[PDB]
Symmetry: D2
Subunit: 287 residues, 4 copies
């Protein structure tokens, strides 16, 4: 009978920006995919179509490019400027969500202005402003890893639907997707990203795995124990199955050498590793 407008947000998504720094002959490249969405009083926009409060998504896009002209130290510093601009520039805009994917480039043979894409991972950043409060979540994704041994899986309950054989030697392969929330915007964003990346990789490789859940816990633990500015880190790790092919029918054996890398289905293990005492449900993990 009675209808109400709940949570809502709008903006320009996937604004592909490439910023070249060339004050000198040694060019630098920053490559981003930016998304900007505003939150505030947009009641009349939805109920009557009154756009008095609707800062056009096209305008939001223009602002991204206009601000890029001044340059930015890091992706997070750039998002901070955008959110500050919109929340403060319009009285009816009380906050928003600004995010970006950062793509890496490597110089071609150390050339001053020629590069190739490093597609092995994608860095992410998300800024959320709610009135007087703001929070930043950084992350990494698309980083595929694999252990050819040093992985086990046994001791699991065996019910009517269980057929999986226990094993003390299997391949452990996953795609590293992690996102961590900072407890302060006063961070050396680039240095921490590199550190976290190394910690996750190290924990994955050096942990003798008794389960993907265990490996993930150790990856998240290393990060929390190492960075005081991080209150928690969330991870979503698929278990990309590599089946040891049965070669007995061909008169052969398969000593953990020949595998069939299956696409789907896959295991999906997810968890939040956090610093004792920190809040368990920050708003930034929603909408």
């Amino acid at each position: 009978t009675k209808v109400v407008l709940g949570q809502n947000q709008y903006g320009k998504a996937e604004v592909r920006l490439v910023k070249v720094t060339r004050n000198t002959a040694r060019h630098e490249i920053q490559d981003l995919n930016v998304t900007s969405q505003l939150r505030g009083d947009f009641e009349a926009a939805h109920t009557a179509g009154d756009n008095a409060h609707v800062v056009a998504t096209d305008t939001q896009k223009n602002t991204v490019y206009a601000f890029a002209r001044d340059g930015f130290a890091t992706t997070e510093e750039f998002l901070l400027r955008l959110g500050k601009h919109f929340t403060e520039g319009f009285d009816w805009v009380t906050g928003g969500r600004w995010a970006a994917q950062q793509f890496f480039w490597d110089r071609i043979n150390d050339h001053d202005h020629a590069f190739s894409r490093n597609k092995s991972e994608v860095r992410t950043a998300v800024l959320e402003i709610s009135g007087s409060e703001q929070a930043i979540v950084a992350g990494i994704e698309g980083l595929t890893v694999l252990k050819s041994t040093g992985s086990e899986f046994h001791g699991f309950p065996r019910d009517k639907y269980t057929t999986l054989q226990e094993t003390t030697d299997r391949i452990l392969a996953t795609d590293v997707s992690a996102r961590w929330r900072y407890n302060t915007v006063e961070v050396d964003f680039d240095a921490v990203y590199a550190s976290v990346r190394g910690l996750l990789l190290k924990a994955f490789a050096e942990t003798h795995s008794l389960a993907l859940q265990q490996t993930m816990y150790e990856m998240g633990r290393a990060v929390i124990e190492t960075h005081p500015e991080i209150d928690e880190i969330k991870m979503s790790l698929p278990n990309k199955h590599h089946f040891l092919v049965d070669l007995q029918p061909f008169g052969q054996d398969n000593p953990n050498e020949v595998f069939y890398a299956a696409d789907r289905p896959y295991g999906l293990i997810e968890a939040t590793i956090q610093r004792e005492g920190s809040r368990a449900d920050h708003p930034i993990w929603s909408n």
Copy 2:
């Protein structure tokens, strides 16, 4: 300084199931992409690699196929059976999240056992159990719609970065992605899905749009007002830009006929239309 395991879940993702009903010559097809994840006490599994509580993702997979043998009336009913099985079959399992995508098939010229895929839309369903609480969210995605007229956008503020020209006649194109939460399990799931689909399409097409926001509001309003079993519906609608090409440099006019369909960037308008008084932030939305 103390590290602690927070929210977590695990299971098998994207189990592709095709169920054929052939007790009669008139074969029927049910096509799903199922994901199953459990929640409960998995503390030891993460901190010590003790898998006593870890129902193998392989087992969860086997269960999906075994349960499909008995058949199911709807996707939601199928997910309900899985959720009850795991939560009740294991004491340390207190809940979880079971989701599925349903793909449609049409008979080839009414053939008894030959079909073609209807890729114009994908139906979704998600069941979440938390203790004694159960919640179901159904939805639709991948349904692309377009209005060649009956759309306007003007009256928006103009700042230093605004260059967009007001208009009273433009193309409005989007991909309908909607999800609605049921307030009861006593629902004719297939009947409501077909009805909601028709209501979203009807509202999109018949509403003289003054803004995508207004169109989205009308689509949601229609659903809430028609179905007592729905407490809220969320929508994420991209505004897929179709630019009117300027042919004047060539001495030709373009009476809203020739357009360039851009990929990115795109506007992204999202909102929640709720039944007045209903829950503000159900946990099923955060996953």
Copy 3:
């Protein structure tokens, strides 16, 4: 020692065009993905960077939109116009390849100007011009089909690497990818496309399959036998495996009802069905 520039072509690829017909209240929609590439004397452009013969890809793009203004009955007609324009307008351009994907839209409840995308198939057209000769190849792709029965596979040879079991009842699923070459440009393109589509579907569903190769042959034969204007048709059909899941480990049988739809690998059966006497290797197929 001696390097030579061989075959070459260049142009603008994937120009997204949406042409709306609104002479009256009953709007029509034509949605294309156009690619234009030229062939001729571009020796100096490659070897010396002399761009005198290089009609800019940007110009080719503009030409596509400029020609769209005048409208067009069929996709093939539109491509013919482009080919004629470039070959005759520049003396050093001796030929080219113009291609397009045509996307289908359906009216929303018979609305005058509101539509929904029919994503169940994509139509293709390719025009190649060489000197004074031209050829057109039309096609269909993305049309997924499945037979729940009426498919067998037995009688194949067995070697030491053979483990497949014979069967008289299996699911046969594929993606219909077919392309056919017209032996004249005087064709009712839209009518032949609709007919061919129908013939392929009929042969697929109605042929009791003893092999994917056999079904494909029948599909091709139906087309050649029905349309005099078609000299040959090439098909590429993957065999989308739907494995009958083994439920015996769970105490159940599986009477051809529960299947696992695997992604990869997949069988890939390809063939050219030709009209006795027609050309054996027309250049359009190579590119």
Copy 4:
């Protein structure tokens, strides 16, 4: 008026193989996506469903894994083994087409058995056997490159649809997709691939580009001039547009710093650079 079976081939496509070498604690990883297709006398299989000559695609799949058990020096040599096996092991099999994609992995901190994927490029190999002739085409794809300067485009004709302005400073970005045909199978496949990759990147980066066509020509020339075993190299280079954003309406200049990286459309420049006097129509290119 009669129907004839023309060219045809069939087999198993995209067989995902991971071969782990673990003779010592220093594990090695070989990751391939293999496709196997046979050619020969399959007339009866198509016209009558007689499968006597049809070596099951499932059998072809099995052979891939069985052969992997013995290990292989390079991707090309693995394909050669498969091709010879099928062509020599079946009288009605006169040839075929075997191809593979090779995915690269890097050790994590020089770890003995932990690796991460290098997704910056994918290596390819295609082998076609016809009687006693064995033809191999190696290649690379997915290698995105970009020059921030050192690229110009001017001197092109300005026809009636030309609006593009001349420029002496622009970004040149492309996806390096190249394939070269060896004139002998006696090649150090890994060494030549590494050399070719280096030469393409070197020519792309150091050539002051007056056009994408020129840059492509220099890339191919370098390969042909350096490797006697290569008869020709074909490249398909998209011109991925990075449009210099006009910030003048916002009161700012933009000294080649802020760009909009567009998705579509894109220029597509392609050409074959051959060794003078070599075969210009090898069958392997038709596929």
